[PDB]
Ligand binder design. Structure first.
Ligand SMILES: *[C@@H]1O[C@H](CO)[C@@H](O[C@@H]2O[C@H](CO)[C@@H](O[C@@H]3O[C@H](CO[C@H]4O[C@H](CO)[C@@H](O)[C@H](O[C@H]5O[C@H](CO)[C@@H](O)[C@H](O)[C@@H]5O)[C@@H]4O)[C@@H](O)[C@H](O[C@@H]4O[C@H](CO)[C@@H](O)[C@H](O)[C@@H]4O)[C@@H]3O)[C@H](O)[C@H]2NC(C)=O)[C@H](O)[C@H]1NC(C)=O
Ligand SMILES: *[C@@H]1O[C@H](CO)[C@@H](O[C@@H]2O[C@H](CO)[C@@H](O[C@@H]3O[C@H](CO)[C@@H](O)[C@H](O[C@H]4O[C@H](CO)[C@@H](O)[C@H](O)[C@@H]4O)[C@@H]3O)[C@H](O)[C@H]2NC(C)=O)[C@H](O)[C@H]1NC(C)=O
Ligand SMILES: [O-][O-]
Ligand SMILES: [Cu+2]
Ligand SMILES: [Cu+2]
Ligand SMILES: [Cu+2]
Ligand SMILES: [Cu+2]
Length: 497
């Protein structure tokens, strides 16, 4: 795997991951983008080189490193017009950050418009040389990463605004459509008698996926970047941008077994081997599995996940019991999503730059209603009440700059102020849920908060949490090339975007 120091060269290319050629945004020649790897304590120097030529999929770009805190490097967080202006084609930009206090399973993706959908999305793993879970498995390497990607035959700008689901689901970059039921499937090799730490990464743009492996169970040991107490399951519903590590014990008979990743909409089920890949034991014939689906008897619920090392819930054990409660009221006008009456529109001057220039109060920050200012070292609680008014539910909400406690999950009326799982992406459920989260403001800067369905994000389903605006300038020392981005971008012709 490349990294922790590396060149990420962006180009446009024809790809056919599911048997059908279309143009894509690729990274060092491939989509999904390649695995970036390093270890706890590393310094990542990822030099993004923009050589994109296709305006329809955007020649400009910006890259987010999903799940990293970026403490004191808010400039590198990637999010376009919040954290930087876009990189222009013909240019480079070095993302330079440290990961001193974090390990686990992450990913990276374009954070401009719906560009990540057109192919700029890949896995990112930070290994812990003293992983507390290491005794549970034998093998954890580049070949134990499993990615899932909803794949479209029409490009994101050319297609529907809220598309009717994917054409294919890609498992490790490969899969089938109804029209291409003899395209190559991905194969994941195992050896009988060994235990694998599989790191499952959703690169999804919209649908969630219900993931299983015939004949096998999965012992979950990590949710997003957070180590969990081991939880054995046999089906996982993974929402856009979520991750899980799970241990698979490869001690079934030597055979081919179907790996299944069924989306809630699009092309559903398994006809012709769609939404499928192959788990192949060494020595088995190199042929499709003939295993059949078993009804799950131990599906994953977020309520059953708890952290491995105790992770104390900020604030006090009762609703609204924190320095700053917020409630996020979703709505939708048929075109744009709205949070507390406002649809995020990206500003010309990035929010960070606004703050550096001296804008530190919510009323002086543009766009007016979308930016909330938070005091430092303060406990926060945010509730995301699902509503008939925000269609496309369940919406998986993501907070940059933080992992957070999920005190109330989707499908639960219970509040857990004691030992809830922490993570960075959480499903806000269906009408009747009031999914609720907590975190401490210990990370000065402006951090995006949004639905990770990329079509909803591009339609304004976002706000910005500008924490500690007074110390934001001094804590986030900016490099000259970051300063150079906006003049270069603002100089561009509309057709060169
Ligand atoms: C920069 O990047 C962009 C984005 O990736 C690249 O865009 C590609 O642009 C080309 C055209 O320039 C485009 O091909 C065209 O696609 C349209 C749309 O197709 C859909 O239309 C219907 C959807 O509801 C549906 O009927 C249709 O289905 C059928 O299409 C063909 C049938 O033979 C089959 O392949 C397919 O399986 C299915 O049966 C599509 O889903 C299409 O209409 C175009 O064909 C046109 O037909 C009209 C009809 O009257 C004619 O008037 C036109 O003369 C024309 O023949 C054509 O196929 C790609 O779809 C775009 N790619 C993506 C991923 O969106 C762009 O190329 C790139 N630039 C460079 C320089 O590389
Ligand atoms: C999802 O969860 C959120 C967070 O819990 C929830 O928002 C909160 O709702 C409660 C009540 O529904 C709000 O609490 C109010 O606080 C003020 C006090 O300043 C008052 O309006 C109320 O206090 C009392 O009023 C009467 C006393 O005269 C009593 O008879 C009454 O019982 C109250 O105790 C009330 O407590 C709280 O302000 C919000 N938090 C926000 C908006 O940030 C939200 O409603 C939930 N959404 C869904 C759809 O379930
Ligand atoms: O994070 O998008
Ligand atoms: Cu993300
Ligand atoms: Cu993120
Ligand atoms: Cu959404
Ligand atoms: Cu984001």
């Amino acid at each position: 795997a490349i990294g922790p120091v590396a060149d990420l060269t962006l180009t446009n290319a024809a790809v056919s991951p599911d048997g059908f050629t279309r143009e894509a945004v690729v990274v060092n020649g491939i989509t999904p983008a390649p695995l970036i790897a390093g270890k706890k304590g590393d310094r990542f120097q990822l030099n993004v080189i923009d050589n994109l030529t296709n305006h329809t999929m955007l020649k400009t770009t910006s890259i987010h490193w999903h799940g990293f805190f970026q403490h004191g490097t808010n400039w590198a967080d990637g999010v376009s017009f919040v954290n930087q202006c876009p990189i222009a084609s013909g240019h480079s930009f070095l993302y330079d950050f440290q990961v001193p206090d974090q390990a686990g399973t992450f990913w990276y993706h374009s954070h401009l418009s719906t560009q990540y959908c057109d192919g700029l999305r890949g896995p990112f793993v930070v290994y812990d040389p003293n992983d507390p879970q290491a005794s549970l498995y034998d093998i954890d390497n580049d070949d134990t990463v499993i990615t899932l990607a909803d794949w479209y035959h029409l490009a994101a700008k050319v297609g529907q605004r809220f598309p009717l689901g994917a054409d294919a689901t890609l498992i490790n970059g490969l899969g089938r459509t109804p029209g291409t039921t003899s395209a190559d499937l991905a194969v994941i090799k195992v050896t009988q008698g060994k235990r694998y730490r599989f790191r499952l990464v959703s690169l999804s743009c919209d649908p969630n996926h219900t993931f299983s492996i015939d004949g096998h169970t999965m012992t979950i040991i990590e949710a997003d970047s957070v180590n969990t107490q081991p939880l054995e399951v046999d089906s996982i519903q993974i929402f856009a941008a979520q991750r899980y590590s799970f241990v698979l014990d490869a001690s079934q008979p030597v055979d081919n077994y179907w790996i299944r990743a069924n989306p809630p909409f699009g092309n559903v089920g398994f006809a012709g081997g769609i939404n499928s890949a192959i788990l192949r034991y060494d020595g088995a014939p190199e042929v499709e599995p003939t295993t059949t689906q078993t009804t799950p008897t131990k599906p994953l619920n977020e309520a059953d996940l708890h952290p491995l090392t105790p992770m104390p819930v900020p604030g006090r054990p009762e609703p609204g019991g924190v320095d700053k409660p917020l409630n996020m009221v979703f709505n939708f006008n048929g075109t744009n999503f709205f949070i507390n009456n406002h649809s995020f529109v990206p500003p010309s001057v990035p929010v960070l730059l606004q703050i550096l220039s001296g804008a530190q109060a919510a009323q002086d920050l543009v766009p007016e209603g979308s930016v909330y200012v938070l005091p430092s070292n303060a406990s926060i609680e945010i509730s995301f009440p699902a509503t008939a008014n925000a269609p496309g539910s369940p919406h998986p909400f993501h907070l940059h700059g933080h992992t957070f406690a999920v005190v109330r999950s989707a499908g639960s009326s219970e509040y857990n102020y004691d030992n809830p799982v922490f993570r960075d992406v959480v499903s806000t459920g269906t009408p009747g849920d009031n999914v609720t989260i907590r975190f401490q403001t210990n990370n000065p800067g402006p951090w995006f908060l949004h639905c990770h369905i990329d079509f909803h994000l591009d339609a304004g389903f976002a706000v910005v949490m500008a924490e500690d605006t007074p110390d934001t300038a001094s804590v986030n020392q900016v490099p000259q090339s970051w300063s150079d981005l906006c003049p270069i971008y603002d100089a561009l012709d509309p057709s060169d975007l």
